[PDB]
Design a protein around this ligand. Structure first.
Ligand code: HEM
Ligand SMILES: O=C1O[C@@H]2[C@@H](O)CO[C@]2(O)C1(O)O
Ligand code: NA
Length: 250
């Protein structure tokens, strides 16, 4: 009941469904689901509840936001998706990029995340510096996900499981390597690799390791490593919340 979703036209809803189908095909065919999940997350994760600035309002299309250091490489994702966007002028970029994130999780075998249309494209990007710093720890994660975005500790641990997709690139973040042996498969392997310690061929960031030493985060890592269904349930809830920060609040 925390949300009151806007009414959109039948034509808007039809465009969402047709765009979903085109996104499913493109993301699968080009093997770019991890990049598209990162696009949606960096679009949404800039929300700050105290000022109600940032969040999933289409501003990743803005070259000034693409130039943020944390967003290196997301210009590739924006350009890959633009041919589909041009077929759906009625849709906001805000909705379109969050739909891409939902589809990315779907096509890699993850949960079905609900999607509610109607986000506005806002003119001003957030200030640079809202997103989490991979070199920091649990206090920082709580400041960013908790105090800025308004999400819970469970949400932090479940959303970190998104690193079951993809990898770090030396020219983008500067880190290099994949978290899992199956970077195009959405499963609970991220938590299993965390628990087993470091191993050759795989990467862990300091922010990942912070989940192991924190007394509230660690039981959730244990849970998700043992129970993929529980991970999918909590991930679905957290991604839905993330994708709607600042949107349709009652
Ligand atoms: C918890 C704090 C987080 C930190 C510190 C963090 C940091 C990073 C870094 C440094 C990269 C590498 C970028 C590159 O070099 O290409 C990355 C990639 C990625 N992030 Fe995270 N991230 C966090 C949370 C999340 C969340 C919440 C999600 C989505 C639910 C997510 C999804 C991804 C994905 C899928 C990739 C791989 C992208 C690709 O393969 O192109 N991350 N993240
Ligand atoms: O998801 C992704 O799409 C890119 C594609 O080139 C293959 O791997 C990538 O570099 C990626 O991980 O960013
Ligand atoms: Na994986």
């Amino acid at each position: 009941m925390a949300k009151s979703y806007p009414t959109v036209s039948a034509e808007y809803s039809e465009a969402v469904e047709k765009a979903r189908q085109k996104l499913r095909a493109l993301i699968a065919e080009k093997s770019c689901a991890p990049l598209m999940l990162r696009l949606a997350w960096h679009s949404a994760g800039t929300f700050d509840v105290s000022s109600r600035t940032g969040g999933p309002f289409g501003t990743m299309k803005n070259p000034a936001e693409l130039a943020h250091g944390a967003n290196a490489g997301l210009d590739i994702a924006v350009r890959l998706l633009e041919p589909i966007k041009e077929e759906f002028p009625i849709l906001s970029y805000a909705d379109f990029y969050q739909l891409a994130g939902v589809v990315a999780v779907e096509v890699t075998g993850g949960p079905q995340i609900p999607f509610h249309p109607g986000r506005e494209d806002k003119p001003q990007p957030p200030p640079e510096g809202r997103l989490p710093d991979a070199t920091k720890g649990s206090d920082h994660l709580r400041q960013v996900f908790g105090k800025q975005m308004g999400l819970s500790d469970q949400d932090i641990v479940a959303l970190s499981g998104g690193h079951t997709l993809g990898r770090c690139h030396k020219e983008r973040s500067g880190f290099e390597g994949a978290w899992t042996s199956n970077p195009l498969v959405f499963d609970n392997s991220y938590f299993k690799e965390l628990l087993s310690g470091d191993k050759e061929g795989l990467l862990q960031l300091p922010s990942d390791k912070a989940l192991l030493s924190d007394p509230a985060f660690r039981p959730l890592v244990d849970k998700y490593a043992a129970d993929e269904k529980a991970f999918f349930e909590d991930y679905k809830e957290a991604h839905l919340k993330l994708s709607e920060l600042g949107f349709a609040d009652a």
